[PDB]
Design a protein around this ligand. Structure first.
Ligand SMILES: Cc1onc(-c2ccccc2Cl)c1C(=O)N[C@@H]1C(=O)N2[C@@H]1SC(C)(C)[C@@H]2C(=O)O
Lengths: 472, 123
């Protein structure tokens, strides 16, 4: 409108909102569909749900490879959104009980889920990188605000999805049975609308082309670099001053520098799966903590489950508050938050949140009687301080990570560093699954462990962020 | 393994509370389901309770209101039929299936592999 912000990002943030809406509206009904429509084992349903989630987490690698190495982006977004819409069509087609039964339903549902995972993994990094591409490299201050608005759109989509999903699967009969076809078709229409609105802004975008088979060049350059050193019975200059400088008889400098930056950022990101796994162990145990504390609140009775909704709402409140007030106040003085101090401070805040959760659990345990009521029974409040701290950590770490991934990536591989950021979440999710079964510790002792682990992870990231060499 | 059952005659609009005790491998390793076989009829699905009792399902009829519970300690399973009628005067069976990965419906006979003998609840 005025300046410094293209009209294009309007059909980027809206698309992201519409996509998250549909994704969270479908994933919510997925498990009920498995259990009460397909009539699957609990083990089978949970395993299929977790496999689908993991594939969704892991596919953005393929999406970013396709985008950067070939076809550019805004063409991988379009085609993978078409694949996403096809997957939604199949999934909603398999929930119709009229045609086929127990075999067409299973096949169509599984194929649709595979296509949905493919689409999501390739709309995730490409859309963020494409929206970032709309700003001139000099406008590095408007890009951060755009990324804040992008995260706000994500969280708003999640919140409206949570608030609107139970209405669709509430006492609706498709054909003499519970209506799952609508529950899966509404997300399909939302995805179709997202694709339409994104395509509507084609003439305004700033589509840049790919810089060649960048992924193959990167792999071959790394392979040559590693292979050169193997001078078992010889060697006078295998590689000095770096492990890539003597992969220079080919792979000109403009590629060696790009792979250097890529490897630097990847080594920096190494520790983030542990942070993601540790911070993901709060939406399950905090529910157990809530179940042990009063939730009448005088005005409105609060069920422990509903407290989960306090995270997206607090993110919505904190994003504008952080960007427009707190960061400006910090900038008032000489204090300089370098986008890596922000992430470390977010990790410290998450550690503090888990320590506060441990303290609240300790207070809960120390109950003694004076239907008998324990005098020292905490209200569902006192869960606010940990929700405030953990939410501020997510705003600082997550919004800063998207910008850091883009600003530090070579132009040839802008969406590959976005896949690297998403790859940490994918690996972190695997850690949660591998460690979920191992649970035999007290709630207070567990939180004091996660707080301590989250501290050690932050010291490792802080030390490696100190020696990081920024891209230039 | 070695499931059992217990129950008997009931009033036209009374209620019944059936038992199913496992006398073998631990009860937490088995998905359980209730079936009925009216005289001169095919076996019908009644209710199903998964391991840990987290997931429960009831037949479309669910005459009145059924409720399946299970305590994996002592391995006992309960079915609470509430508003019985002149119908459903069938022989009620208990079925157990070891946990595994399968795509067969949890509300079908072929899903279950240990059908214990059945009661003779009548109305
Ligand atoms: C973390 C995170 O930070 N930015 C993103 C992101 C990055 C690009 C496009 C869209 C998103 Cl949502 C992102 C993400 O994609 N995943 C987020 C994450 O982690 N969670 C959200 S989705 C989820 C609820 C399945 C998952 C979880 O809680 O397991």
């Amino acid at each position: 409108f005025g300046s410094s912000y293209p009209v294009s990002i309007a059909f980027i943030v809206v698309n992201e909102f519409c996509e998250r809406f549909s994704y969270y509206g479908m994933k919510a009904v997925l498990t009920l569909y498995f259990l009460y429509f397909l009539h699957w084992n609990e083990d089978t349903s949970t395993s299929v749900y977790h496999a689908f989630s993991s594939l969704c987490y892991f596919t953005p690698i393929l999406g970013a490879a396709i985008a950067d190495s070939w076809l550019g982006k805004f063409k991988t977004i379009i085609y993978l959104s078409l694949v996403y819409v096809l997957g939604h069509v199949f999934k909603s087609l398999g929930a119709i009980p009229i045609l086929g039964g127990k075999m067409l339903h299973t096949i169509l549902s599984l194929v649709g889920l595979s296509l949905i995972a493919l689409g999501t993994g390739g709309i995730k990094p490409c859309v963020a990188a494409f929206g970032g591409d709309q700003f001139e490299e000099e406008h590095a201050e408007a890009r951060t605000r755009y990324f804040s608005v992008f995260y706000l759109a994500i969280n708003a989509g999640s919140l409206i999805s949570t608030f609107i999903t139970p209405m669709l699967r509430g006492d609706v009969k498709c054909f003499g049975q519970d209506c799952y076809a609508l529950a899966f078709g509404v997300p399909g229409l939302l995805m179709v609308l997202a694709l339409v609105v994104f395509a509507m802004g084609s003439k305004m975008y700033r589509k840049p082309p790919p810089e060649g088979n960048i992924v193959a060049q990167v792999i071959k350059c790394i392979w040559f670099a590693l292979c050169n050193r193997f001078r078992n019975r010889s060697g006078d200059l295998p590689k000095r001053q770096h492990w890539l400088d003597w992969a220079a008889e080919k792979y000109p400098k403009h590629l060696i520098a790009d792979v250097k930056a890529l490897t630097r950022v990847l080594f920096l990101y190494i520790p983030l799966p542990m942070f993601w796994a540790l911070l993901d162990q709060q939406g399950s145990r905090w529910t157990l903590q809530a179940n042990k504390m009063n939730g009448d609140l005088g005005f409105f009775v609060l069920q422990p489950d509903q407290m989960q909704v306090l995270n997206p709402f607090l993110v919505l409140i904190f994003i504008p508050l952080f960007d427009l007030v707190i960061y400006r106040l910090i900038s008032k003085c000489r204090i300089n938050f370098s986008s890596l101090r922000k992430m470390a401070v977010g990790m410290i805040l998450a550690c503090l949140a888990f320590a506060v959760a441990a303290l609240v659990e300790t207070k809960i345990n120390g109950m003694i009687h004076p239907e008998d009521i324990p005098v020292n029974k905490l209200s569902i409040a006192w869960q606010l301080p940990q929700y405030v701290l953990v939410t501020a950590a997510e705003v600082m770490f997550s919004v800063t990570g998207l910008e850091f991934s883009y600003s530090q990536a070579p132009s040839s591989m802008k969406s590959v560093l976005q896949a690297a950021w998403l790859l940490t979440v994918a690996v972190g999710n695997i850690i949660v699954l591998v460690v979920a079964q191992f649970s035999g510790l007290a709630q207070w002792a567990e939180f004091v462990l996660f707080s301590c682990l989250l501290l050690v992870v932050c010291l490792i990231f802080s030390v490696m962020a100190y020696y990081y060499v920024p891209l230039k | 393994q070695l499931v059992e059952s217990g129950g008997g005659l009931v009033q036209p609009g009374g209620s019944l509370r059936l038992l199913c005790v496992a006398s073998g491998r631990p009860f937490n390793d088995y998905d359980m389901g209730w079936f009925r076989q009216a005289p001169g009829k095919e076996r019908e699905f009644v209710a199903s309770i998964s391991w840990s009792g987290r997931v429960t399902d009831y037949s479309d009829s669910m005459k009145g209101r059924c409720t399946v519970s299970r305590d994996n300690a002592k391995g006992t399973m309960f079915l609470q039929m509430s508003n019985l009628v002149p119908r459903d005067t069938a022989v009620y069976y208990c079925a157990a299936a070891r946990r595994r990965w399968t795509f067969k419906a949890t509300n079908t006979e072929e899903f279950y592999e240990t059908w214990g003998q059945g009661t003779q609840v009548t109305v």
